[PDB]
UniProtKB/Swiss-Prot annotation, chain A:
Disulfide topology: 136-150, 203-204
Glycan-linked positions: 32, 76, 207
Subcellular location: Cell membrane
Disrupted-gene phenotype: Mutant worms are morphologically similar to the wild-type but exhibit mild swimming defects and are lethargic with their movement being interrupted by frequent pauses when crawling on a food-free environment. On the same environment, in other occasions they display decreased rates of spontaneous reversal and steering, and slightly increased average speed. Homozygotes are fully resistant to monepantel but heterozygotes are partially affected by the drug with reduced fertility and slightly impaired movement.
Segments on the Extracellular side according to the record's topology features: 1-223
Function text: Betaine receptor that functions as a ligand-gated non-selective monovalent cation channel in mechanosensory neurons to maintain basal levels of locomotion. The channel is permeable to Na(+) and K(+) but not to Ba(2+) or Ca(2+) ions. Elicits current in response to betaine, very weak current in response to choline, virtually no current in response to acetylcholine and nicotine, and no current in response to glycine and GABA.
Protein name, UniProt field: Betaine receptor acr-23
Organism: Caenorhabditis elegans
Leftover remarks: Suppresses snf-3 mutant phenotype growth defects. Elicits no current in response to the broad-spectrum antiparasitic medicine ivermectin. This channel is allosterically sensitive to monepantel, an anthelmintic of the amino-acetonitrile derivatives (AADs) class, leading to muscle paralysis upon treatment with monepantel.
Family: Belongs to the ligand-gated ion channel (TC 1.A.9) family. Acetylcholine receptor (TC 1.A.9.1) subfamily.
UniProt note on tissues of expression: Expressed in the body wall muscles that are arranged into four longitudinal bundles, some mechanosensory neurons, the head muscles and multiple interneurons. Not expressed in motor neurons (at protein level).
Primary gene name: acr-23
Length: 227, 165
């Protein structure tokens, strides 16, 4: 009455939860995670050290099978906001990353939970900005008329696809959103590609899923030609 | 008698509080947040990387509906100071920011609470210095006679206007 309904809802849904373990109640199927990326800026291209710096936004969606509630019991509430430290999150990792500290390349604040039923779980959505330090091989044979292609690989560091599965989410113009991209004074983006691959462990008969993102960039040679 | 009145006031107002959730008791209206900025310095303008560095002071004001008390019960006290970790704070975010760590661009120490009544809540004011790394597009066509305009966008990262305005 004199306290927010969110207090009671959080106390109810947070009772038996353990965030340190995967919330897999159904044995048959794994947990599906959908990932989408939007590119905003190309900060730096480093040829001597062979890395690329990008600024992007990432969205991940999955279903938690242990956080369901009945809306009618809680004043017809169908949504709530919780801190990212309270609940379990998949370990989405950039395999070819040159940054070891996640506090300088990511910023997680909150997650949104939408109920699907008392015994059906809730849908979890996580959106956060990030800065990627991607190591890619650069060919400078046709400088300054060269074009480069660097790959981004995403997946689970420790979980096989029988537990966590990954699927890509694409936009209207392509796999990677470019509607809010900031134009660079030295590079131009030509296109993007996405590919989903299942890879076999070389010690076990189990698979894991990897997502490959391709970005094609071309140099602008007017400055060098005129200078 | 031999202990500060602030001890009892904080113990009274901090009893049933949960800082991890928004303190919205009234269903009809959202929580209104007022923001003001003061500019102190322009540290650096970076053209190759297209970002701007500023030093500014930010003030935010809102009403917490769960932290009200009667002044007459506590020796006619109408103000108190509390650490920013104790109470709930809105997530004011600079959308076009190039800095991912908030410990190197912000410094929060304390908040001030002014009571509005036992069942009316308290007014919360938060002032802190900050350093902004703002990415803006620069046009160098008229260099060195050029003028630039960079935009700063502020808002809530996860809450719609039906909750925080
Ligand atoms: C793990 O991934 C491999 C990828 O090669 C899968 O291998 C495929 O197996 C089917 C039969 O089950 C064949 O028809 C395909 O030709 C195989 N792929 C290729 C590229 O040859 C495998 O099925 C996956 N699952 C496991 C091993 O359980
Ligand atoms: C939603 O639940 C509340 C319970 O407080 C009820 O008063 C209201 O009529 C319900 N509305 C609908 C559309 O079910
Ligand atoms: C304020 O409250 C105190 C209670 O300790 C009382 O002694 C004092 O007279 C009050 N003053 C006013 C102006 O109400």
């Amino acid at each position: 009455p004199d306290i927010p309904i969110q207090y009671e809802l959080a106390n109810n849904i947070m009772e038996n939860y353990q965030k340190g373990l995967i919330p897999k109640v159904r044995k048959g199927s794994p947990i599906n995670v959908t990932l989408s990326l939007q590119l905003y800026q190309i900060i730096q291209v480093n040829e001597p050290q062979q890395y690329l710096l990008l600024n992007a936004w990432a969205v991940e969606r999955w279903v938690d099978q242990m956080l369901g509630w009945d809306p009618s019991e809680f004043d017809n509430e169908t949504e709530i906001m919780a801190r990212h430290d309270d609940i379990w999150l998949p370990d989405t990792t950039l395999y070819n990353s040159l940054e070891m500290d996640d506090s300088a390349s990511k910023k997680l604040t909150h997650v949104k939970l939408t109920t699907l039923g008392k015994n059906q779980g809730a849908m979890v959505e996580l959106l956060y900005p990030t800065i990627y330090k991607i190591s890619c091989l650069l060919n400078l044979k046709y400088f300054p008329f060269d074009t480069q292609t660097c790959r981004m690989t995403f997946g689970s560091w420790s979980f096989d696809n029988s537990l966590i599965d990954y699927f890509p989410r694409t936009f209207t113009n392509g796999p990677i959103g470019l509607a809010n991209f900031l134009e660079n004074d030295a590079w131009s983006v030509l296109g993007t590609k996405v590919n989903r691959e299942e890879k076999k462990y070389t010690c076990c008969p189990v698979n894991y899923t990897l997502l490959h993102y391709d970005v094609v960039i071309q140099r602008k040679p007017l400055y060098y030609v005129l200078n």
